[PDB]
Amino acid sequence: KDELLYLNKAVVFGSGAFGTALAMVLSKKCREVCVWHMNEEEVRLVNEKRENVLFLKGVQLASNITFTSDVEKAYNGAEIILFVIPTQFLRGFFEKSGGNLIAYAKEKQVPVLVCTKGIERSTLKFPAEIIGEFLPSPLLSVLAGPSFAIEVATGVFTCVSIASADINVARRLQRIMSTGDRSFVCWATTDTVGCEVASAVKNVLAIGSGVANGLGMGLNARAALIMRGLLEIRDLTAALGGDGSAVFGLAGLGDLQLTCSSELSRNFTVGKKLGKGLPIEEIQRAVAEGVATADPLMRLAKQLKVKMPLCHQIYEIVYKKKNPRDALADLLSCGLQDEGLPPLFK
Amino acid sequence: KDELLYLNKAVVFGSGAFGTALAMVLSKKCREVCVWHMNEEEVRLVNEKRENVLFLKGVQLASNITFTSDVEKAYNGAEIILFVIPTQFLRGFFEKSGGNLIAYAKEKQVPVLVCTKGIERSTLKFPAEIIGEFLPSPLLSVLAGPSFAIEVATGVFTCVSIASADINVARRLQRIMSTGDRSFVCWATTDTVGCEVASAVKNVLAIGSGVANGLGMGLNARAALIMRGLLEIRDLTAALGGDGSAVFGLAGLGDLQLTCSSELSRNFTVGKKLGKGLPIEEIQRAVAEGVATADPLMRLAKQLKVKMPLCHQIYEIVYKKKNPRDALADLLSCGLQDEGLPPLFK
Numbered sequence: 001k002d003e004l005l006y007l008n009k010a011v012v013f014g015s016g017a018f019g020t021a022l023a024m025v026l027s028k029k030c031r032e033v034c035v036w037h038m039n040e041e042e043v044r045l046v047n048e049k050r051e052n053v054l055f056l057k058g059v060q061l062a063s064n065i066t067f068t069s070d071v072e073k074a075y076n077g078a079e080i081i082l083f084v085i086p087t088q089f090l091r092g093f094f095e096k097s098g099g100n101l102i103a104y105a106k107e108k109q110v111p112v113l114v115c116t117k118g119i120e121r122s123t124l125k126f127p128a129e130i131i132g133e134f135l136p137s138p139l140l141s142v143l144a145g146p147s148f149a150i151e152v153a154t155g156v157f158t159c160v161s162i163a164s165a166d167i168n169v170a171r172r173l174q175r176i177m178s179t180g181d182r183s184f185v186c187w188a189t190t191d192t193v194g195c196e197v198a199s200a201v202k203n204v205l206a207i208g209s210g211v212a213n214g215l216g217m218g219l220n221a222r223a224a225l226i227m228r229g230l231l232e233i234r235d236l237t238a239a240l241g242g243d244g245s246a247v248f249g250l251a252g253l254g255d256l257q258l259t260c261s262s263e264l265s266r267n268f269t270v271g272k273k274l275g276k277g278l279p280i281e282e283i284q285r286a287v288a289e290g291v292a293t294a295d296p297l298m299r300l301a302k303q304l305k306v307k308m309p310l311c312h313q314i315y316e317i318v319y320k321k322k323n324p325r326d327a328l329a330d331l332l333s334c335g336l337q338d339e340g341l342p343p344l345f346k
Numbered sequence: 347k348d349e350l351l352y353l354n355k356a357v358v359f360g361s362g363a364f365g366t367a368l369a370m371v372l373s374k375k376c377r378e379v380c381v382w383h384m385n386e387e388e389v390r391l392v393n394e395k396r397e398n399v400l401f402l403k404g405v406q407l408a409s410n411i412t413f414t415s416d417v418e419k420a421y422n423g424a425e426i427i428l429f430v431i432p433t434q435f436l437r438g439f440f441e442k443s444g445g446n447l448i449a450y451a452k453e454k455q456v457p458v459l460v461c462t463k464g465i466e467r468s469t470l471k472f473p474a475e476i477i478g479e480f481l482p483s484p485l486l487s488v489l490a491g492p493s494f495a496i497e498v499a500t501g502v503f504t505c506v507s508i509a510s511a512d513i514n515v516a517r518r519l520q521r522i523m524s525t526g527d528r529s530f531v532c533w534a535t536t537d538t539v540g541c542e543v544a545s546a547v548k549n550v551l552a553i554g555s556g557v558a559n560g561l562g563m564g565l566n567a568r569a570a571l572i573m574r575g576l577l578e579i580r581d582l583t584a585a586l587g588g589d590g591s592a593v594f595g596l597a598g599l600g601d602l603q604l605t606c607s608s609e610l611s612r613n614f615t616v617g618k619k620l621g622k623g624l625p626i627e628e629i630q631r632a633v634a635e636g637v638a639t640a641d642p643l644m645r646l647a648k649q650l651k652v653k654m655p656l657c658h659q660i661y662e663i664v665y666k667k668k669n670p671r672d673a674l675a676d677l678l679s680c681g682l683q684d685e686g687l688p689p690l691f692k
């Protein structure tokens with residue numbers, strides 16, 4: 001059924017740019033939308049100026065969006081729950097404040113949409129997997145795709161995929177998240193692993209994109225990094241048991257090419273400074289997702305015996321003061337090779 | 347063998363930007379490089395100013411690159427032949443001036459590299475297929491990948507794929523085209539059809555990218571157009587008997603994302619003006635490859651019963667004065683769907 005679903009209430013845990021942007025999306029499909037933010041003082045401010053001046057300045061929030069520091073009131077009555085809490089705080093949130101939330105979600109069978117991205121350092125697990133330790137899979141879906149927050153928040157045409165092991169679960173969330181004016185369109189897929197992998201790895205690759213630019217390279221190089229980088233996402237996805245159908249879709253190449261072409265992003269800028277010879281210490285003044293993700297990514301890759309040429313070199317440049325130019329030469333020391341892509345048709 | 351091959355002579359038929367750029371690449375692997383250009387008066391000019399002021403202004407040609415209007419002297423002694431002659435002139439060139447050239451190529455078993463891109467209107471065939479009517483396949487390879495001419499001509503890091511039904515043929519051309527400083531790296535593949543399809547369709551899609559921009563959309567939209575557009579390249583490739591291994595590689599998504607992000611390209615500008623409501627007649631002052639390719643592409647698609655949503659709508663906007671906004675709505679009238687990508691791993 002391509003018929004949309006409207007709800008009475010939606011709750012979004014995570015007040016970042018993406019989370020706020022998604023709250024704007026939901027304000028067009030849900031009579032009420034609550035956005036949980038821990039700092040009460042800042043919550044009042046946001047509700048007063050009707051604008052998330054903290055992480056989405058310049059965008060006026062719909063009048064039916066209300067920020068709150070009260071976890072209980074936040075999810076109370078919600079018919080869909082979105083998690084956009086940073087990876088490092090995810091587990092702690094559930095242990096310290098998710099008790100009743102979890103019970104409610106299970107009791108009322110409320111759909112949960114995972115929008116958090118990254119890799120937990122202690123377990124090398126992805127967001128949806130972490131959340132899966134507290135909530136059952138039947139209620140878990142992941143949202144991923146080329147979706148700059150500003151564009152999503154202001155209703156500029158955007159496409160994303162919704163992933164769930166059970167495609168029917170994804171299709172229902174697809175009916176909830178897709179907007180009436182077709183400005184936010186969702187596509188269903190089963191590849192939850194591919195989505196989480198791509199969402200994490202793209203940030204590391206984006207730093208490599210920055211490096212290439214700071215190294216004097218142009219757009220041909222960026223296109224090659226994206227194409228060869230996507231294969232690393234594919235290989236890691238396979239090793240993690242993912243079906244891989246999201247790799248060459250919106251969450252995979254779609255989001256990857258977008259993220260690697262965002263020259264003003266912190267991942268890019270950090271990479272550019274690294275390509276220009278600046279030491280990481282000096283650059284650190286700004287925590288780019290790519291920097292934080294590179295270590296656990298490398299450890300997970302090693303643990304699974306997955307070779308990730310680009311990501312490995314990016315880790316060396318960022319963590320082992322490796323000279324960008326030398327890293328590049330090492331990458332190319334492999335010699336002439338075949339593109340390494342299987343045929344699609346026999 | 348990852349060991350490079352150097353030659354005494356190389357000839358490039360086609361003096362355009364890409365052809366000249368490739369001549370620069372060859373000047374680093376071939377003692378002598380001839381570039382055929384029909385107009386003798388212009389040939390003398392280029393050789394005097396040692397610069398292709400006609401299609402690659404600003405780039406000084408290597409001293410071992412010589413332009414010429416003499417087809418015979420051009421290929422005489424060449425150990426590799428590149429064709430970059432525009433599609434519409436390809437067949438006529440072989441009929442009127444390729445007689446001895448063809449004989450020589452067959453006699454000496456000289457490798458031929460097809461760099462021309464497009465669709466011949468009269469036969470709806472691709473460049474390598476057209477050339478295949480005069481020369482045997484064993485000697486035919488195709489070059490495709492994200493490769494802006496200026497960057498290639500000046501040695502800025504670039505990656506491309508070399509396609510040949512017989513992978514061993516591609517691997518040898520890969521040893522010839524790849525440069526000693528690893529600034530131009532070639533990857534071998536068998537998907538000649540996918541490469542030719544992607545190279546032609548990308549220009550039509552680039553116009554759609556322009557439309558999206560002139561329509562007020564942002565980068566999320568562009569990323570979605572690239573991802574969904576790639577599927578049209580895939581489907582058409584399948585229908586033409588291609589193995590498809592190039593679709594998600596350098597010649598496919600690599601070149602596509604690059605071509606769709608070139609905001610200053612004619613395909614983009616034409617698309618932008620169309621998205622802004624300007625009639626094609628008014629815009630035409632500049633023949634964008636996308637405009638010329640859209641008609642034969644649509645006719646070939648219809649002939650093979652291949653649905654190409656984006657390319658079809660772009661054809662309507664360009665040839666049938668269809669309102670960009672209406673085209674967009676028609677594209678989205680399909681309703682909620684699954685992403686439609688098969689799993690890569692079982």
Ligand SMILES: CCCCCCCCCCCCCCC
Pocket residue numbers: 208209211212221222224225228309310313314327328331332334505
């Ligand atoms: C980290 C610097 C940016 C690199 C520029 C892109 C180069 C892409 C080529 C990758 C080839 C990898 C060889 C496979 C082992």
Ligand SMILES: CCCCCCCCCCCCCCC
Pocket residue numbers: 159554555557558567568570571574655656659660673674677678680
């Ligand atoms: C031609 C205008 C540009 C369109 C902007 C990109 C939209 C991509 C969505 C395509 C969906 C196609 C539905 C499949 C039939």
Ligand SMILES: Fc1nc(Cl)c2nc[nH]c2n1
Pocket residue numbers: 038085086089090092093
């Ligand atoms: F952001 C953010 N979110 C949550 Cl949930 C937190 N818990 C402790 N610090 C935290 N910071």
Ligand SMILES: Fc1nc(Cl)c2nc[nH]c2n1
Pocket residue numbers: 384431432435436438439
């Ligand atoms: F460009 C270009 N190339 C060739 Cl080969 C031609 N033959 C006739 N006009 C032509 N224009």
